Swiss-Prot record:
Disulfide bonds: C6-C128, C30-C116, C65-C81, C77-C95
Keywords (A to Z) from UniProt: Amyloid, Amyloidosis, Antimicrobial, Bacteriolytic enzyme, Disease variant, Disulfide bond, Glycosidase, Hydrolase, Secreted, Signal
Chemical reaction(s) catalysed: Hydrolysis of (1->4)-beta-linkages between N-acetylmuramic acid and N-acetyl-D-glucosamine residues in a peptidoglycan and between N-acetyl-D-glucosamine residues in chitodextrins
Lineage: superkingdom: Eukaryota
Keyword Signal appears in the UniProt entry: yes
Species name: Homo sapiens (Human)
Listed name of the protein: Lysozyme C
Disulfide bond as UniProt keyword: yes
CDD domains xrefs: LYZ_C (cd16897)
Active site: E35, D53
Length: 130
């Protein structure tokens, strides 16, 4: 499912993302836009990750979710990679919260460092009333 901008902002605010680990809602919105264009069904082979990235947040199956019942999956989020491709993003938010809790924080996403860090994230929550 592809979220309209303000729709997503409200959902993430409802899910406790604004200010989480000190990351404002604007930053999460900027991340989601460049990683997936707000589409829950997005998937890409990430050269950097040497694995496939799943959904709205482009979370990897290398460390965070188990893709295809692999007995040997790290599965830090203890979720099937498919759950991160759903229309209800509660699971994807729970898992992204987990990713930012590790030593790299928001920088764990190269796209954030590349398209959002030290820039105008304000426009993404614009007019949303969030």
């Amino acid at each position: 499912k592809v979220f309209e901008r303000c729709e997503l902002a409200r959902t993430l605010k409802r899910l406790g993302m604004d200010g989480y680990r000190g990351i404002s809602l604007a930053n999460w919105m900027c991340l989601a836009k460049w990683e997936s264009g707000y589409n829950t069904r997005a998937t890409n082979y990430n050269a950097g990750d040497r694995s496939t990235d799943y959904g709205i947040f482009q979370i990897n199956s290398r460390y965070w979710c188990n893709h295809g019942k692999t007995p040997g999956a790290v599965n830090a989020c203890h979720l099937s990679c498919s759950a991160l491709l759903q229309d209800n993003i509660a699971d994807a938010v729970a898992c992204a919260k987990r990713v930012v809790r590790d030593p790299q924080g928001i920088r764990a996403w190269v796209a954030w460092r590349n398209r959002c860090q030290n820039r105008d994230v304000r426009q993404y929550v614009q007019g949303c009333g969030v």
